[model samples]
Target chain A: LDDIITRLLEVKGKPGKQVVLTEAEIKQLCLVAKETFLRQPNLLELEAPIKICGDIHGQYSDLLRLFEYGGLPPQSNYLFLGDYVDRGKQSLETICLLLAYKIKYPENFFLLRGNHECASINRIYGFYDECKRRFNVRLWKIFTDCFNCLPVAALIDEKILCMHGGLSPDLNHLDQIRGLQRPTDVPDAGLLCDLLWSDPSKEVQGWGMNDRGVSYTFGADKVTEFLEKHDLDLICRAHQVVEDGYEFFANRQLVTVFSAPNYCGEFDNAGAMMSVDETLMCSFQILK
Target chain B: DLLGLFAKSKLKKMMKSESFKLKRFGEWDDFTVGYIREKLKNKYPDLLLNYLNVYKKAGNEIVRHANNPNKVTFSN
Candidate 1:
């Protein structure tokens, strides 16, 4: 297991072109990492002075660049808000590296589930096809099983709530997140789905329809309301693509952090990582 | 007379074929989905309507609800 971590790290500078590990190694890593996730609480109560990252979307080079810029795992605490797979060329290497990191740094490094982590979205977005072509359908199924067990959300020092998506109507209490069972798929609509699919909109004031077609789009007032009700400071999420890589909504009450630069080789957007100090002084590290 | 008539007809067809178009969507309601559809139309073949529907169906297939508490396993 330790050797697996070393191998992944050694190939960090290399792009997503090489096959670093065999299919059997990935299967073992996923199974072991699933146990590691089960050992921890679903709703992680973590401290500050950690770095927060947003969607990767299979840009393995940019992911390695982020680690180089922010310092590697275990050296700095990380709470990634998900979207680790899909839409890029190297979903297998990307997810395998993340899973390896999770297994190695079980306490310091954390991962949350994104909308693409679900089988339905990744099936078409690029991951399922990548798996079927590179390995087999069975391997993709293994990935789906592992993704089903991923933690959906994390709370930083009881002040910041981090997830792949935005607020939900059913998320009045934080325990609802802690109580959610694993090895299950994301529902069409619920706390779990919203946490991984919902978005924030400036056009609407309260709960509104999300164009993404699944979860609701929330307003600024909802952000303020949720924060005041829960006594949290901010809602950190990542799903939409903002031109600046990080966009503030609801007067900075919520932030959308995207860590993919030149997304899909289409948008000329810079990537960013949010760094929070021990005193919770938040700042951005741009990768342009 | 024949050359003049053909030239006029070709200019008329060109005018009818060309029109001004908006570079972006009209409102925020469509920006997120609209951009992806316009940019990657081939990948999102269904235009996201049925894509989202199948997403829901996939969840229903594996979700462990109150009525169905079965868990998914990878044991073979």
Candidate 2:
């Protein structure tokens, strides 16, 4: 694990370069990470003065930039909202480094599953093709099995609720997430799907139709109501691209943080990370 | 294209300002879209409306533009 981390860090900021890890190394890493996820709860209960990040989407260079700017893990506690393995050039390097870090710092470092982490989603996206070219189909299946065990949501000092996507209408109690099973695929329509696929709408008053045509789109009032009922300070999430890197919804009750700058080499968007202190105060570190 | 360029420069200036940092790090009360829209509406209504109107996109559009090495191209 230490050697894997050392090798990944060696190629930190060089884009268009690939890290050559063996199939057995990747298999061992995934198996270790899967067990790590199983050991942790479905809804991770974490503490702050930690950095909360949004989607990486397989942007390996940006991931390295984030660590440099935000400080490396164990140095600064980190929680990554997923979308870690699709649409970017270096999904292998991106997911491998993250899984390696998860094994390295299981307590301080955390990863949540995104909609893209699933087998069905990545099979069409670039991940399947990348794996087939670089390694094999069986390795990709190993990754999918590991992603299945990832935690879906996290809470920071019981104040801020963090997830890859937005809230679920089914999420009245946090225990609903605590009680969610592991090694489970993201369902079509339910709590897990909504957690991975839902988006927040400034236009709609209640739940609206997601343009993605998967889960629901929630409104500002819903955010306020949820925070009020659950005694949480905020809902921190990431899904859609926001121009500022971090966009606030629901009168700042919820925030969308997208950490993949120049997303897909097309969108002229800056990436950002939100740092929450032990006191629960929050601030942004921008990557332009 | 004109307002788009203009807004980008203006936003870049504001985002890099020291006052922005003070507000951001001190209180974490950085500018919100509503706050910016309220400030710009009276003078730059078109840009204000553009900012206010959050766009929605479909999933297929994302896949079309997504990074894919094996994506087939024409002109061959």
Residues A1-288 of candidate 2 have per-residue lDDT tens digits of 578666654554356765577889889889999999999999998887789889888888899999998888779999999999889989998998888889888999999999999999999988998899899999999999999999999988777889998887566578888898999988766688889998999987666656786666888977877776776768999988898899988888899999999899999999999988766768898888
lDDT of 1 by residue, B1-74 (tens): 46431143533443344221111112213433323333432332332333222221211122211222221111
lDDT by residue for model 1 (A1-288), tens: 688667765664477485767789888878988888888888988886799999999998899889988898878989888899999888787888888889888889999999999999999999999898888899999999999989989988677889999887667578889999988898776678889988999996566657787767888977877776676778899998888989999988899999999899999998989988776778889887
Q: Which portions of model 2 show Cα errors greater than 4 Å?
A: A1-16, B1-76
lDDT of 1 at A165: 93
For candidate 2, what is the DockQ? Answer: 0.01
Candidate 2 chain A lowest-lDDT run of ten: A5-14
- Error at A61, model 1, angstroms: 0.1
Which TM-score value belongs to model 2?
A: 0.77
What is the TM-score of each predicted model, taking all chains together? 0.78, 0.77
Off by over 4 Å in 1: B1-76
- Report how far residue A86 has shifted in candidate 2, in Å: 0.9
